[PDB]
Structures are given as structure tokens and as C-alpha cells.
A and B are shown apart, each in its own frame.
Chain A
Amino acid sequence: SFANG
């Protein structure tokens, strides 16, 4: 999944 950053 995606992550802040």
C-alpha cells in the first residue's frame, strides 16, 4: 500500500 512520504 502507499505511505506518506
Chain B
Amino acid sequence: LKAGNFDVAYQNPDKAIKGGNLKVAYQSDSPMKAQWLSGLSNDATFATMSGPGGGQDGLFFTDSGFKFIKGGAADVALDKESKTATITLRKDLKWSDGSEVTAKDYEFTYETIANPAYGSDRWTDSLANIVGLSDYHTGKAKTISGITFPDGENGKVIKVQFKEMKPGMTQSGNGYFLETVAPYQYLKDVAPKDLASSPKTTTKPLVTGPFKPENVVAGESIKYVPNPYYWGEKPKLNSITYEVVSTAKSVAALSSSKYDIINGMVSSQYKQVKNLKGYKVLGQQAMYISLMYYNLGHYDAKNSINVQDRKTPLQDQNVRQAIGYARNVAEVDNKFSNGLSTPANSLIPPIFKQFTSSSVKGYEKQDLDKANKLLDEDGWKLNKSTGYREKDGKELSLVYAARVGDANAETIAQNYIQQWKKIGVKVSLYNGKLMEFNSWVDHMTTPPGANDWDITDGSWSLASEPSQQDLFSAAAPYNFGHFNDSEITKDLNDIDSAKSENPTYRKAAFVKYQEDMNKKAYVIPTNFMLNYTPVNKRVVGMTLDYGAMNTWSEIGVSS
């Protein structure tokens, strides 16, 4: 397996020993926040750090495209004719203290998120599709009617009843049902409003995974030891330590071999890591898309709809396409990215093999000729004196709300401005400078939207159900440019239709959607990304493969 020129796995030629201690770190300049309950946890650092303990007690295995498979802590089955998910817990799934994992423990997860008393921020409207749950959530019902237990609370089966099936329900991270358990018997006597701060969820939790946290140092570390009661295969290792390391201290740690594995390392550091003897640098395709938006209208909050009513040359498809073809993304990436940004052909990242295809053609290749032609034949005639094109007497001049963040943010934006000059388009930065992130979010997300930009950039970390509704639908607030297209609406609907319960059909729907978006060019896909992970050469069985379900059990060291 490769990801770009990166290997996904480190095939160590040396056998693992019995036992050993593995030293892992997460790169963060901010402290970890321990919270073992998924619903109550808001810290991304700690979520990752919880991996050896079961990842906040996730239940389902998946394939390498995040499609549910059988064989994890539990199984999930979907029955369309009855509108039901059936979650079947393993006969021998236990908590770390030996107690059984039961049907109640799954239901309890729902309570942690849905009952406001716990203070979760993790409710979503998707959950209102489960029967009874909105009513539980607003306090109208004392219980969640659509969640029933075929063999009772202390049984191993839960049935979840929906108002409508959704084809994304076969993908992990779909959000229509939840994927974790909480130890009801361990936590039942904790007042909901105290749950998040309790030892029992923070420093002294119960977990279901291969390791359990023997010690937790607030903000800093976990000491993992084997969890005797884990259902799967006994780990090779005796222990794992998992610590936060600052961005500034990371490279040093690798040089001294203080950590065998450092996760979360940033792209700008790669050139420093690449040459470290002692390490194998793995890579993997990220759940990420960056793109260019064009400003085409406004958002009507009251009526929850985007109206594509803005006066701008960008209303011309030819102009939208031309500004895309003019960019040199591939060139930019080759200069700056160290291989970790690669040109997107489409809006769905290639890690989603079941949802896209490299056959879809976008703006991944600069074509200045085509760009100049498109503009030519749309009446934007070059004004020889000025070096910029005009139509009906007005210059083709736009504002680019480029933003800070990327090590080479300033330089990249300048490159694009110059490319655009080449095709007779005059482009300037929003107020002559890059926008700060928080200013950019505000600018983009505040209804009804601003009229004082034309082009901007956005980037998303996608969930493992790569839903486009919330980014690009007519009703989405996050449709920053505010386009509204019947064909696009149709396409998006088809993707989430009953027909799309069939994977082949869904694939084709995703593909058509991607094609249509590139053609219409309301937005333009920019980059896909790779993540990297340095691994000490003594590590055995390490891999970034997203279908690898037992790495913490399999992983070892050769000495």
C-alpha cells in the first residue's frame, strides 16, 4: 500500500519480542483534556490519545473506506423494511473491570448526548431522525421510545428505530446512530451535571479496548496496560505510554528517540523528519478537501435558503471555469508541500474509493490557453493598454479573500494573483492582506453574507460519511458562495436516496455530483492532503491503513 510516494505500513523485517513498552506522543501546543466518554469529549488531542483504550469505546470495525464490517466489539445490521438498526454486542465484551457491556450501556451513550443536563455539545439534528429522541432531548419524554431492547437492559442487543433510512448509514461517522458505549453501572449514581468532571470519566474510567489507562496525568499523559478483559487478542506489549509533546520539542524527541511514534505532526516539519536516521516515515491519504469558493449570492436565514442573486462576472460559467484553469496548484504544491498536498480533481477525497474516481477531471492541470479562450469567447476582451479584459466597458477585477494559516500562505496567494494577471484578470487581497482565521469564519458564516469579496478558500476535515448536504446544499449555511442549482440539488438528493442503498448506484451518484460541480464551477477543488507519521525502526506491525482494526494488539517492538 502506498499513499503518494509514502508507504502506509512499516514492514519491519525483525520479529517482535514478547512484551516491551511503546512510547507514543501527540504533537500539541495545548494540553490534552481527558474525557473518556465520547459524548462529553471535545478535545481532539485526547480523542486520538484514547486509541489504545478503545477510542472512547467505539463499537464497530470498518473496511479501509470506513464501511462497517462485522467482527468488532459489536455488529450493526440495517433492515430497510422495518427502518431499524440492530446493534449486537459481543457475548464476551466486558468493561475493564470485568463487568459486562450491556444493551443499557449503549442506550446510555444517547442519554449523555441528548439529555442537556450532561452538557454535551455533540447533539445533531441527524439524531432527531431516531424515533422518540427529539422528545427525550427537549424533555418531553422520560425515555427514548425508538430505542428498545430485545433481551432487555442487561441483554446484548439494541434495536434503533428511525423515521427514514439513509444510505450513509453503512459508513462509520454517519451520525444517524451512535457508535460508542458508556458504563452505566459505573456511572449511574453520578449526577449528570457532574459527570464530565468526575474521576470516573477522567482519571479513573472504565474502558473496553485492548489497553486500559493505569494512570492519567491531567493534561499530559496516559499509562496504558493490558486490559485483561478485552475480547480480542491479547496485546504483544506490556505497556504503552502516550504523551503530549510541543511542536517545538517534537524534532528533538525524535533525535533522542524519546518516542517511538509521534502523531499529529505538521506539514512544515516534514523536511526535518525526512532525514532522521532511525525512523521510517509513513504516510496516508487524509480525510480532507480544500477548495476555492466564488461569491454568488446571499443566505436567507429565516427561510433557510441560499439565493444566488449577487451581481458579479462570476455569474458567468466561463469566468468561473477560467479562473480555475488559470491556477497552478500542481506547481504550487510541488514547490511548497513536500509532497503532502496534491491537486484535487474533485470534491471527494480519493481515500473514499467507493465514492469517487480519479477519472473525474477538474482544475488539477493549469490550462492558461483554455482560460484565455473561455474569456475571449465570453466577451471579455483584453484591453491592450491595461493588460486586463473588459466587457460592456467595465474591467474584470475581483477581490480574493485569502487567509492566513499555511506556512506559505502569503506566497501562494501571490502566485495565484499573478496567474490570474496572465489571463487578464485583476485580483487583489481582501483589504490588502491575508485574513486571520477567526475573521474569515465570521466573514463567511454570518448571514446574510458579505458583498465585498469575490474569491475565497476553504478547507474541511471530512467525516467518514463524506456528506455534501451540509456544505453545498441550497439550505446550508456553509454554502459560503451561496449557489443554488436545480441539477446540483437533484444530484445531492440522489446521493442520499433509497436507491443509493446500493453501493454501485451511490458511487455513480457521487461521481455525477462531482462532475456536475466541476463543470458548473460554483466552487473549485484545490488540494487533497497526506498525513505523515514517524516510526522508530524498532517498531513491529505499525501501519496507517484505515482498515487495520487490531493495530494496538498487533503492534510490538523488535528489541
Contacts and interface: CB of A to CB of B under 8 A. Distances in A.
A4 B290 CA distance: 10
A2 B463 contact: yes
Nearest to B122: A1
A2 B467 CA distance: 8
Contacts of B124: 1
A3 B175 CA distance: 14
Contact of A4 (B441, B463, B467, B470): B441
A1 to B, nearest CB: 6
Nearest to A1: B463
B181 to A, nearest CB: 21
Nearest to A5: B461
B175 A4 contact: no
A3 B192 CA distance: 27
B459 A5 contact: yes
Interface string B218-253: 000000000000000000000000000000000000
Nearest to B405: A5
A1 B477 CA distance: 14
A4 B463 CA distance: 11
Contacts of A3: 460-461
- With a 10 A CB-CB cut-off, give which of B288, B460, B471 has the most chain A CB atoms: B460
A3 B99 CA distance: 36
A2 B471 contact: yes
Interface of A: 1-5
9 contacts: A1-B175, A1-B463, A1-B470, A2-B460, A2-B463, A2-B471, A3-B461, A4-B460, A5-B460
Given A1-B470, A2-B461, A2-B463, 17 more contacts: A1-B124, A1-B175, A1-B463, A1-B467, A2-B460, A2-B467, A2-B470, A2-B471, A3-B460, A3-B461, A4-B441, A4-B458, A4-B459, A4-B461, A5-B288, A5-B459, A5-B461
Across chains A and B, which 4 residue pairs bring their CB atoms closest together, nearest first? A5-B461, A2-B460, A3-B461, A2-B462
